[PDB]
Design a protein around this ligand. Structure first.
Ligand SMILES: C[C@@H](c1cc[n+]([C@@H]2O[C@H](COP(=O)(O)OP(=O)(O)OC[C@H]3O[C@@H](n4cnc5c4ncn4ccnc54)[C@H](O)[C@@H]3O)[C@@H](O)[C@H]2O)cc1)N(C)C(=O)NCC(F)(F)F
Ligand SMILES: C[C@@H](c1cc[n+]([C@@H]2O[C@H](COP(=O)(O)OP(=O)(O)OC[C@H]3O[C@@H](n4cnc5c4ncn4ccnc54)[C@H](O)[C@@H]3O)[C@@H](O)[C@H]2O)cc1)N(C)C(=O)NCC(F)(F)F
Lengths: 140, 140
């Protein structure tokens, strides 16, 4: 069972999410990221179960990463789905801020507005080692 | 002296450049990247010396990575300057292709058109471990 689930946007956060995975594995964490650890079977069941299994939920907030969540009332968006699961399970949610603009909570579906209440870590290109050390301090 | 110099764009390639650095360091290579290894003094001299000192030159070709080189006929752009130094010094140039569109040589300044004659490696998000193993195979 992975210790960490990384949720991210393919088209703007794929490289940062991969970088976080290599660093966290170096420090002994078992990490889930979709392109490497989602295996056979129905992906909607498997993706949700992988969130539930991980104590830590690392959320990569690249520019516009919550845009596809907006007006997603039927919960079709996968980042929306993973966030709702992490909130409902009371996970240790650790957002990573990489050029993200903070929206007003009311542009987001009601069932995920509470994701904006968790303390985030600012990603620093110049001070990456110090950023990773802070992330490890936030992990349980 | 570092064995690998990484040339990249801050705006589109910073995360990939950082991911490559960690992977290559994990395999025992000494790596130059500006935000961690460029230290005190005149950066024009120090940047060029570091390209001259590194046997391998890894060039991160993110989308539009050479756009600022086109029309830079006085060679003021830093990726332009790094490429010319690598070509003049006969370095082992290894381009990494991440969504890059190949330009025709006639849109690039003459002193760097030869960069288009080196074999590149396609970056695969789904098969990152295989991509890294291939990159290590290209390195000297
Ligand atoms: C669905 C997709 C997936 C997985 C995990 N997430 C998680 O959500 C966040 C990412 O969100 P986002 O940036 O928006 O990405 P998205 O725009 O949704 O997916 C686009 C890609 O999905 C594939 N695709 C497009 N249409 C369809 C389809 N597949 C099955 N179909 C049936 C009917 N129609 C389709 C295409 O390959 C497309 O390229 C992250 O946390 C993720 O863990 C999101 C989506 N999936 C199962 C997958 O990739 N399996 C291979 C892997 F195991 F290697 F991953
Ligand atoms: C010049 C800059 C630098 C270094 C290395 N490269 C290499 O070229 C490729 C990147 O190319 P590119 O993405 O285009 O970069 P650029 O569009 O020039 O801007 C980037 C930043 O430069 C700052 N800046 C903007 N103007 C000025 C200035 N600083 C000092 N000045 C004095 C007079 N005017 C300026 C801005 O803060 C901007 O954010 C890579 O390979 C690199 O190794 C390129 C540029 N530098 C010394 C630096 O960063 N030192 C800190 C570090 F050690 F941590 F790096």
């Amino acid at each position: 069972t992975p210790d960490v689930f990384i949720s991210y946007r393919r088209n703007s956060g794929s490289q940062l999410a991969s970088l976080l995975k290599v660093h966290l594995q170096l420090h002994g964490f078992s990490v889930f990221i979709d392109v490497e650890k989602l295996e056979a079977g129905k992906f909607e069941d498997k993706l949700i179960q992988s969130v539930m299994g991980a104590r830590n939920f690392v959320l990569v907030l690249s520019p516009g990463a919550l845009d596809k969540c907006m007006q997603d009332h039927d919960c079709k968006d996968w980042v929306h789905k993973e966030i709702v699961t992490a909130l409902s399970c009371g996970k240790n949610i650790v957002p990573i801020i990489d050029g993200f603009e903070w929206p007003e909570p009311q542009v987001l579906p009601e069932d995920m507005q509470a994701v904006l209440t968790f303390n985030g870590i600012k990603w620093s290109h110049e001070y990456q080692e110090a950023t990773i050390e802070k992330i490890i301090r936030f992990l349980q």
